[PDB]
Amino acid sequence: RRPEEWGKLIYQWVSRSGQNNSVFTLYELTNGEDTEDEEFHGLDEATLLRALQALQQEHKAEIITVSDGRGVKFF
């Protein structure tokens, strides 16, 4: 695997099915209920952020890093 590959998998999941939300905490992507059966559940924050950074570079995501509400929006 690679962070960009993890990126490909996460973005696939946001689009295919779980399409109500555009805004996700980093925690719920890896430890939430809706993603429990996905290949990226349990993925560490560090690698998740690098996955999301590759997505952000392709304009598919914008990361929110403020401590009062960390997470990511997908486009």
Binding site: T25, Y27, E28, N31, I64, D68, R70, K73
Partner: protein, 35 residues
């Protein structure tokens, strides 16, 4: 420029407070059966 709204960030502040409580809830669930 940013494509994230004040509304988007407001969801996230609440979803974060939810998340941290969920982490403690899971820890309790685990302990309830531990004994």
């Amino acid at each position: 420029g940013s494509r994230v709204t004040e509304q988007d960030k407001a969801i996230l502040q609440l979803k974060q407070q939810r998340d941290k409580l969920r982490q403690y809830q899971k820890r309790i669930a685990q302990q309830l059966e531990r004994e």
